[PDB]
Design a protein around this ligand. Structure first.
Ligand SMILES: Nc1nc2c(ncn2[C@@H]2O[C@H](COP(=O)(O)OP(=O)(O)O)[C@@H](O)[C@H]2O)c(=O)[nH]1
Ligand SMILES: Nc1nc2c(ncn2[C@@H]2O[C@H](COP(=O)(O)OP(=O)(O)O)[C@@H](O)[C@H]2O)c(=O)[nH]1
Ligand SMILES: [Mg+2]
Ligand SMILES: [Mg+2]
Lengths: 166, 181
């Protein structure tokens, strides 16, 4: 669907200018699946998963079960099906954004698992994550699905063009 | 030295987690000290591309080892990595006079970190089993220890071949920790 592949998209970032992206969310949000769905190389476990591609680093841990310096973006992943864990996803998101080391990070939310029938819309997610009153930072929500692969490149294209803009 | 190592280390307040960094140039004997301590498994991880980090965890006390003063590469770095350090044990190979100025240089570049403000500093003048090992006062002079500031520090002669001085060192650290009340 999207007009360019992911590698063309990420191709656009200054071929060197190290990019650090934290992709965080509650367990079962679908973060390991997106890492895999990106088809960018393999995931290193260390608990923590990292995917390095050219200049760009992706680091993943689960929330709600220092490290934040020099972060260019936060990808926040939510399971759009999981109604009653979504208030906890909101809390953990708010915990992240009160971090001083993160004050200039872009925020991309993936409203995820949008292939499923129970899947809230972007406005239900923005309302639930109470994003719609975050006005001190550049953010968006994009509907996504690791089972399709849908939303993912759009979301990364968002990040790439916001990163170049600065 | 009187006590065994375990006895020495048991003296530490159990509900106080202790982070130690054991650092210095390659070939100082760092890895060998971790095995010579007979405290259990040495675990290797890679917290960043191009860094071999060895960790030995015993009760509340953790030892971290990586090599400094690579001729190639920037100084090994990763996020945090100096945060909540209780002590640094700086290990020198007491026979490597040739590299002793570089060992000073890397000691000095550790000591200018605030994350390492009030760390205890134990210097192990290591490999003393070897007849060509420099004196304790000779080491002090070559590491320019007289310019060291604002820290509880000492130099202890040590060897992994014989195990000598190690308990002395751990005991120094252990009691200095407690002196902090
Ligand atoms: N329907 C659907 N299921 C997904 C999707 N992504 C992940 N899953 C399933 O969600 C569960 C949690 O996924 P995982 O990637 O390990 O989440 P993690 O805890 O954030 O690392 C697994 O059963 C996945 O198969 C998705 O996009 N759509
Ligand atoms: N003679 C002697 N050799 C030592 C001593 N400690 C380590 N070695 C040896 O010195 C070399 C490197 O020691 P090692 O523990 O790998 O140093 P590291 O590079 O700081 O981790 C190897 O040949 C070790 O077996 C020691 O106390 N006396
Ligand atoms: Mg996972
Ligand atoms: Mg070693």
């Amino acid at each position: 669907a999207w007009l360019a592949s992911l590698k063309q998209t990420l191709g656009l970032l200054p071929a060197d200018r190290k990019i650090r992206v934290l992709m965080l969310g509650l367990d079962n949000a679908g973060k390991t699946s997106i890492l895999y769905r990106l088809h960018l190389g393999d995931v290193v476990t260390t608990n923590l998963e990292t995917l390095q591609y050219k200049n760009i680093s992706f680091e993943v841990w689960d929330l709600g079960g220092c490290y934040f310096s020099d972060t260019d973006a936060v990808i926040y992943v939510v399971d759009s099906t999981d109604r009653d864990r979504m208030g906890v996803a909101k809390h953990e998101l708010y915990a992240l954004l009160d971090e001083d080391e993160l004050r200039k990070s872009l925020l991309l939310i993936f409203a995820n698992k949008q292939d499923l029938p129970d899947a809230a819309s972007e406005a239900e997610i923005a309302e639930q994550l109470g994003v719609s009153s975050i006005m001190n930072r550049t953010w968006t929500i994009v509907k996504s699905s690791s089972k399709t692969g849908d939303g993912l490149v759009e979301g990364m294209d968002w990040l790439v063009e916001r990163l170049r803009e600065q």
